[PDB]
């Protein structure tokens, strides 16, 4: 008597990665984890890290791939199965060049911008159309690579304000979960 949403955080695994741009689906997982109250600990029949608990008034399982961008797909899918989530149902927290720096929008379905974690969930789990809350970090400075952009810390001046704009990413984030996207979207959305 469930089926629960799973909401998960993309990003890469240690310490070398922690505070790159590429992590910000972790930093939110982190920060719901809080909220929720319980560690991560390891999934093992999925490898994945999982927190199971109340979140937005309904029941989650938040997840963080310990497997590396590339290759998330292989933990995403079989967690969602595990639970027998469909893709509907499921959340990708990451972060989007497509958006500047400091702005959040919420998706369902669509492209997949450059993000290689996102192209290996949606190829996992066989179709698109699941939500992703997009954490805009811009584009980057002139002729450097969007891969290699990602890759690389916030400017002293942007990691003054990356605390404040976890937060609100996670409130964004309850906030789909409660009221649904249109809602939700409409709430968050500024242009």
Not at 18 to 33: E, I, Q, S
Request: glycine share 12%.
């Amino acid at each position: 008597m469930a089926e629960p949403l799973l909401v998960v955080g993309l990003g890469n695994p240690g310490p070398t990665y922690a505070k790159t741009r590429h992590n910000l689906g972790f930093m939110v997982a982190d920060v719901l984890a809080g909220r929720i109250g319980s560690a991560f600990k390891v999934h093992k029949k999925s490898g994945a890290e999982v927190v199971t608990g109340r979140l937005a008034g309904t029941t989650v399982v938040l997840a963080k791939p310990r497997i590396s961008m590339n290759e998330s797909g292989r933990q995403v899918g079989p967690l969602a199965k595990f639970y027998s989530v469909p893709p509907q149902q499921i959340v990708v927290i990451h972060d989007e060049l497509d958006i500047d720096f400091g702005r959040i929008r919420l998706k369902l379905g669509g492209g997949e911008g450059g993000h290689n974690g996102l192209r290996s969930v949606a190829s996992a789990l066989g179709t698109k159309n699941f939500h992703r809350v997009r954490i805009g970090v811009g584009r980057p400075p002139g002729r450097k690579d969007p891969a290699a952009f990602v890759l690389e810390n916030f400017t002293s001046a942007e990691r003054a304000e990356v605390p404040t704009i976890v937060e609100q990413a996670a409130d964004a984030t309850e906030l789909l979960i409660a009221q649904g996207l249109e809602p939700a979207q409409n709430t968050v959305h500024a242009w």
